[PDB]
Amino acid sequence: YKLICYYTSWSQYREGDGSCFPDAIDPFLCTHVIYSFANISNNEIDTWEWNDVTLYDTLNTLKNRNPKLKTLLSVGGWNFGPERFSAIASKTQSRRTFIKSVPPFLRTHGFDGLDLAWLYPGRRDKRHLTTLVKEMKAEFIREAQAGTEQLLLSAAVSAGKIAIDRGYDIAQISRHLDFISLLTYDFHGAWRQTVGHHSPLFAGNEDASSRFSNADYAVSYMLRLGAPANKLVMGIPTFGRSFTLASSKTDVGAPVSGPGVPGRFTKEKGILAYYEICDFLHGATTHRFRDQQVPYATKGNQWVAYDDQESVKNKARYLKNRQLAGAMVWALDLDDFRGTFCGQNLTFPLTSAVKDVLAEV
Ligand SMILES: CC(=O)N[C@@H]1[C@@H](O)[C@H](O[C@@H]2O[C@H](CO)[C@@H](O[C@@H]3O[C@H](CO)[C@@H](O)[C@H](O)[C@H]3NC(C)=O)[C@H](O)[C@H]2NC(C)=O)[C@@H](CO)O[C@H]1O
Ligand SMILES: *[C@@H]1O[C@H](CO)[C@@H](O[C@@]2(O)O[C@H](CO)[C@@H](O[C@@H]3O[C@H](CO)[C@@H](O)[C@H](O)[C@@H]3O)[C@H](O)[C@H]2NC(C)=O)[C@H](O)[C@H]1NC(C)=O
């Protein structure tokens, strides 16, 4: 089993305890740590934060304590326009430029592979995304001749029935990718004026109409489209999406006025770090959709959908039962990395929970 963990660049700038650096990461927790995100300039992979080279080096020195640990650098991301990706993949000339720029970069900084986070290719991009993946892998193969261990190539893929059908040739890119991370935590939110859970595991006999927005459907669909179980990694959230209620109705379908108030540390409307949720929980009524097997909480006019230890072990048992390759966690810096916010003194409570289940049978 693989436990792929993302670490995000900007989490260094959070104040107080929210501030998180590579060295706060337990070398033995994950099997792969992914640094998000690299920029692209004059069609070449490039850094993003001013101190990326220091943090790269910090993250990669962890391989000194755990030698089996592999690290990767993710490209693209959310504040990286998909049109920007689009324009590079469609012109064989600039694509080849970017591809050739990658290996030396990873080699200089010490990464073991690249992670493609193009979010998201449209109907018009499907053909080129297939190409970028092919040629990139082809290049990683040609470079291993120099005598060094071959670089890995992975991609963070959408888990939405429509997004998959529109922009991904799943049968083609699995042959070429070392593993695929399924973004199974983006099923609600997206600005819809009703309350709902962004990452349920199951359909839930109740509000069905969506019938496609759950990890179970997403996983089953990918297997059917041609992706082999041993390359699929299922995404597990370490954050929750919040909502400001528009009425006193707290149950399913209740109306919503907009995102939830910002977290004291993460400072962004609509999402909350798990360690912030640990604190939000005191004084809140907690609930659990039993059909979907994920919790949610309320306090005043704040409604929060999140993942506790229990729901996360549950998801982990599921991927074990469908024989997937492992779990992907977004993100280490949102978990209780210090272990001083959630009660029971344990650093990385959610990621550890996943790791425990994966370490059993
Ligand atoms: C749950 C989660 O991880 N959400 C991510 C988004 O938050 C993230 O966007 C990033 O937004 C933050 C603020 O929300 C940006 O932080 C700023 O970063 C710059 C340095 O680049 C720093 O000067 C600022 O102090 C800092 N402060 C602010 C305004 O809060 C961050 O730059 C954004 N990401 C990038 C690559 O620049 C998106 C990003 O793609 O990812 C979500 O996962
Ligand atoms: C990530 O890479 C992108 C694209 O390579 C960068 O995009 C900008 O910022 O690039 C230029 C240069 O910063 C911006 O300004 C131009 O800068 C030159 C000289 O440096 C100047 O003479 C030009 O006339 C412009 O004034 C453009 O506005 C941006 N282009 C685009 C499409 O983004 C970006 O800076 C990088 N982002 C980070 C955070 O590294």
UniProtKB/Swiss-Prot annotation:
Glycans are attached at N39, N345. Disulfide bonds join C5-C30, C278-C342. The keyword Endoplasmic reticulum applies. Detected in mammary gland. SUPFAM superfamilies: (Trans)glycosidases, Chitinase insertion domain. Residues 302-316 are annotated as: Important for AKT1 activation and IL8 production. GO terms for molecular function: carbohydrate binding; chitin binding. Residues 1-361 form the GH18 domain. This is Chitinase-3-like protein 1. The lineage of its organism: Eukaryota, Metazoa, Chordata, Craniata, Vertebrata.
